Amino acid sequence: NSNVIVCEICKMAVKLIVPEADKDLDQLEKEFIQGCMTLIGWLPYAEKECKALAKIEMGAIKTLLENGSAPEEICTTLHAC
Amino acid sequence: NSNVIVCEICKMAVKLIVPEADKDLDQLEKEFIQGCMTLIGWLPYAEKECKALAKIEMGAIKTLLENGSAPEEICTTLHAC
């Protein structure tokens, strides 16, 4: 819909994932969830949003990178940023 | 936490509630939920957030008005806007 902070959430995950030689869930999630909370902790079901976005966003970002997407176009592909 | 769109959500509910001679749930909710979605429909549990915020935000706004809060300070009181 609006997307204005899903896009900041996505830009945040891209920073988390891209520089990492060893891409994997390995507690890159924890870092994602904290920065996700910081951006949406003030919602009644914030924790639940962030748990799900961690898998959805980071999974999507990782595969798009593997299949040749330019890192600065990934959030546009996903969310029209 | 961040609050940047809970504050737009609150400013939106204030517009919905304040001019209304007959303050009540009466499908002022529907209107709230649509404008809430527009602001957060792109989240995995958006509908759930909006259902809850409708009761939390509008209930809080209505009582604060009844007890003498200035309408332009209500979202500051609630969310530090």
Numbering used by the authors:
A (entry chain A), B (entry chain A): 7 to 87
Study text:
The fold is comprised of a four- or five-helix bundle, where a kink in the third helix can lead to occurrence of two helices, α3 and α4.
Ac-SLP-1 exists exclusively as a dimer with an experimentally determined molecular mass of 19700 g/mol (MALS; theoretical M = 19062 g/mol). Ac-SLP-1, despite being a monomer in the asymmetric unit, crystallised as a P2-symmetric dimer that is aligned with one of the crystallographic axes. The buried surface area of 767 Å2 corresponds to about 30% of the monomer surface, and is thus above the threshold for specific interaction interfaces as established by Janin. The most striking feature of the Ac-SLP-1 dimer is a long linear groove connecting the large cavities at their distal ends. Near the N-terminal region, a citrate molecule was found to occupy a special position on a two-fold axis. In contrast to the human hookworm SLP-1, Ac-SLP-1 does not possess a prominent cluster of basic surface residues, but rather three small isolated basic surface areas, comprised of Lys-17/Lys-21 (α1), Lys-36 (α2) and Lys-54/Lys-57 (α3). Ac-SLP-1, in contrast, shows no such feature and has a well ordered internal side chain packing. The trigger event that leads to disassembly of the membrane-associated dimers may come from the tryptophan residue at position 48, which sits in the link area between helices α2 and α3.
